[PDB]
Structure 1
Amino acid sequence: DVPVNLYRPNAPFIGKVISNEPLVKEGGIGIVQHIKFDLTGGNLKYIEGQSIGIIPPGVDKNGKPEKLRLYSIASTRHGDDVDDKTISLCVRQLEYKHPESGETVYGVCSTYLTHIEPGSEVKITGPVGKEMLLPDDPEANVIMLATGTGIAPMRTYLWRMFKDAERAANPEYQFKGFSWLVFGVPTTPNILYKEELEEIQQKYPDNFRLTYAISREQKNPQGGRMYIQDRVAEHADQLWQLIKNQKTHTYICGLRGMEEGIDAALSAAAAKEGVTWSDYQKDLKKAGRWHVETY
């Protein structure tokens, strides 16, 4: 049974911020924060791949109360401390330049969160989501295609799979399959969780493969910016070789734009072997092995 909607927008849980820590190291673009909340007092229950709602303070350009924004849960069911006391979020600060006034414009909810203080209280809803759940099979192959903060569900998967204290805490799940993360960010300092993602890979080298698409330090073979789909095309045949296995699940989280190029890269690899990828993918979706969360 997957717990969904334990708290509803009509009556959110009031969490309290435990810590708000930076994820973009110096030299990096913008602000992405790891925010840990205290759950105790509601005992909000959740699993990996799900989202929560955050309702920020304030009203909009129309006088209306701000509605919730969804954020992917970045911690496992146990929280980062492995004690079932916390839930963590991975939040990029949304700011752009207004479309010809040119004034810096701030996103309401994300700017509230990335500047939120330890001890502050936040309205939390959920969890929601049943489409981004890991299979129970510990020998499953798990392809993880992520841009930016799309890393968030991938951290809940990879932590449950490979953190020492998670294995200790999950006797029913001792992962021994193969996981492959293709992770796209703009710079090397924008690789969220880089150190831990690389600890995992040296710790479990035959179980986790880690591939970077660093937008602004790497050009694809045709002189453009190196995106996730350029990595997919580069390893298109390796990927399609795993996707052909019925033990294999694919998770795509982040920009909706990564998709059509992922579909181009795999459609070519599929074609070489006589398969047409748009039908094959239609069947992977119906089977529930093609998991997509883009926003």
Structure 2
Amino acid sequence: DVPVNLYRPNAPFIGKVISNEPLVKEGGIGIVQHIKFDLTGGNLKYIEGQSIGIIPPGVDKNGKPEKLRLFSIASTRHGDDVDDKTISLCVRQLEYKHPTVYGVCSTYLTHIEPGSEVKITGPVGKEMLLPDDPEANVIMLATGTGIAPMRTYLWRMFKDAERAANPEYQFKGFSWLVFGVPTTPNILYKEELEEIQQKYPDNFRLTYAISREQKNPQGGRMYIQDRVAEHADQLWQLIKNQKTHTYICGLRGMEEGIDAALSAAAAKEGVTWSDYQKDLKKAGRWHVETY
């Protein structure tokens, strides 16, 4: 049922870049690009929450061909134009200290020109799939590029064109995105996210943790864990619903604080969060993808 590995590293799909647009507005930190690829000519299909591999050109420091890097799909199964012909990624340029270094695949992607051919593999992953049940509740805890699978979910749920194309999925549950980025300009897809909340105030809640513009009660910069702590009781109450799914995505590091906050909330009703969570993971309702 779920498509997987229609293309593999030994014989990847050669797609063409259609467009490559900036998601970080002026005054933001770093570079994050929305890149859309043409899938026509092959049979690459995918669903929300999956990933694809991109094989960058060139060789590594040892002269070995570069290997694929995985990127979370940022478009629904239908693509951004709802035509079933494309796929999009949300790619941050990796750059860092000394160990000024630019990540190989991410720099290649963020600077890639439309018309360029790209080696694509996948799709892969069954850990971040959205439930078919339209009355499910969906909690989304994302930082930076972790917004990507969340975009696939929220677009499928809330875009007019998606609703028209998906007769079998008219979402009527409640979705809540807690999104941590350093600055307002760094809020990826800000305009569309807020548009979704204005149109579906009863079905979508949007919460930001903006570290350079907000302080937590302890006076430190505001991070996603802080927002989870702030709304821990509410989040725990939603999670107790048999139909609630929680999704965590972004660079590793946020899970510890999220657990600590949810643990304190659950403890109030005599529940051991770490145990409850184990059962949620077994049931396929606690979805994590960090990197």
TM-score of the superposed pair, with normalisation by structure 1: 0.98
Contact 2:139-2:176 within 8 A present in 1 as well:
yes
Please report how far the alpha carbon of residue 147 of structure 1 lies from its aligned counterpart in structure 2 after TM superposition. 0.5
Per-residue CA distance 1:35-56 (angstroms, 9 max, x = gap): 0000000031000000000000
- Tell me by how many angstroms 1:26 deviates: 0.4
Instruction: Say whether residues 1:162 and 2:168 are aligned partners.
Output: no
Distance in 2, Cα, partners of 1:179 & 1:105: 38
Give the aligned partner of residue 134 of structure 2: 138
RMSD of the alignment, in Å? Answer: 0.6
Once superposed, which parts of structure 1, at least 4 consecutive aligned residues long, lie more than 6 Å away?
Answer: none
1:147-202 CA distances to partner (integer Å, 9 max, x unpaired)? 00000000000000000000000000000000000000010000000000000000
Equivalent residue, structure 2, for 1:173: 169
Moved more, 220-229 or 172-181: 220-229
Aligned partner of residue 282 in structure 1, secondary structure: helix
1:254 to 250, 264, 274: 250
Question: CA–CA distance in 2 between the matches of 1:255 and 1:282?
Answer: 22
Find 2:273's aligned residue among 274, 277, 281: 277
Q: Deviations over 1:250-275 (max 9, x none)?
A: 00001221101000000000011111
2:188 counterpart SS class: coil
Mapped contact 2:141–2:249 kept (Cα < 8 A): yes
**Structure 1 gap segments, 5+ residues each:** none
Shift of 1:229: 0.8
SS in 2 for 1:189: helix
The whole-number CA distance in structure 2 between the counterparts of 1:47 and 1:272 is: 38
Structure 1 contact 53–71 (Cα < 8 Å) conserved: yes
Q: Identify unmatched segments of 5+ residues in structure 2.
A: none
Q: Does 1:71 align with 2:67?
A: no
Contact 2:90–2:145, Cα closer than 8 Å, also in 1: yes
8 Å contact 2:178–2:208 — kept in the other structure?
yes
2:114 to 115, 118, 123: 118
CA positional deviation for 1:216: 1.1
- Residue 58 of structure 1 and its aligned partner are, at CA, apart by 0.4
Deviation at 1:123, TM superposition (A): 0.2
Helix, strand or coil at the partner of 2:113: coil
CA contact (8 A) 2:6 2:43 kept: no
CA contact (8 A) 1:145 1:253 kept: yes
> Matched residue of 2:262: which SS?
helix
The answer to whether the Cα contact below 8 Å between 2:53 and 2:68 also exists between their aligned partners in 1 is yes
- TM-score, scaled relative to structure 2: 0.99
Q: Is the 8 A contact 1:43 1:85 kept in 2?
A: no
How far is 1:30 from its partner? 1.0
